[PDB]
């Protein structure tokens, strides 16, 4: 049963060469048939130790409570993986033909891969939550557009909404370029393009409403623009959270 495609291009670039080399090793094990592996194992231990260290600093100094809960079990997984690598090297010094040593090199390798994957994904989910909080900020501020009655309110509204929109567009653009799923990139870009092209429509609509206060047409055109922008933003929030069983 096939291993899924990695979630983003960054994670892919880091983990794919590992995943492939392990597959090669497994094939060697199942098919056909040795220097002292004590030093390169120690190098892996060192690397993993440093990773866990940086991970702990990230955990202690973050404000994402979900990230605090989900990341630390990845530390345990990779440290446990290193243990198997250490045992494998020790076994091989005793017997270069050791089969359990081979199973350990494979299991330990997979453990590091699986754990490094968990750590990367859990951080990626935290990065996504930041984008979502911004998007939901826009949604909340789109509802207060129905409160703007005076021209000075409109000036204050636009000055607050404007930079919020620009930030959201930058985040979505940066995020779409990282996805390994093309349909998701398309849905994100199409939705964001619609939102940006409805922004001047929304501003002009309530400008008419403010000045006219034919208010009925301007009233409804404003509302319809809001609810359409909101619909598009909600669509973005969903696509951002997509790991397809959907």
């Amino acid at each position: 049963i096939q291993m899924p495609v990695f979630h983003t291009r960054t994670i892919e670039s880091i983990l794919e060469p590992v995943a492939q080399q392990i597959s090669h090793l497994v094939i060697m094990h199942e098919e056909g048939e040795i220097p002292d592996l004590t030093a390169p194992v120690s190098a892996v231990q060192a690397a993993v130790s440093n990773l866990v260290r940086v991970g702990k600093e990230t955990v202690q100094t973050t404000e994402d409570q979900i990230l605090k809960r989900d990341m630390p079990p990845a530390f345990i997984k990779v440290e446990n993986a290193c243990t198997k690598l250490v045992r494998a090297a020790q076994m091989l010094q005793a017997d270069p033909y050791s089969v359990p040593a081979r199973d350990y090199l494979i299991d330990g390798s997979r453990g590091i891969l699986s754990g490094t994957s968990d750590l990367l994904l859990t951080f990626d989910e935290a990065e996504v939550r930041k984008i979502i909080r911004v998007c939901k900020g826009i949604l909340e501020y789109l509802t207060v557009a129905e409160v703007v009655e005076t021209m000075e309110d409109l000036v204050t509204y636009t000055k607050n909404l404007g930079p919020g929109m620009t930030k959201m567009a930058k985040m979505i653009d940066e995020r779409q370029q990282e996805l390994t799923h093309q349909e998701h990139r398309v849905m994100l870009v199409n939705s964001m393009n619609t939102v940006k092209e409805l922004l001047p429509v929304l501003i002009s609509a309530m400008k008419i409403f403010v000045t006219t206060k034919g208010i009925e047409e301007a009233l409804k055109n404003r509302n319809f623009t809001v609810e359409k922008m909101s619909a598009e933003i909600n669509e973005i929030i969903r696509v951002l959270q997509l790991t397809s069983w959907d």
Binding site: I14, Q21, H24, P35, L37, V44, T58
Partner: peptide
């Protein structure tokens, strides 16, 4: 820009590098 992200990616790459070196030494 996102230095917290960069630091994590760098550490994971260092883990990748050491593991690949280990596996390469074994596979020849």
């Amino acid at each position: 820009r996102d230095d917290r992200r960069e630091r994590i990616v760098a550490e994971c790459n260092a883990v990748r590098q050491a593991l690949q070196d280990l596996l390469s030494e074994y596979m020849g």
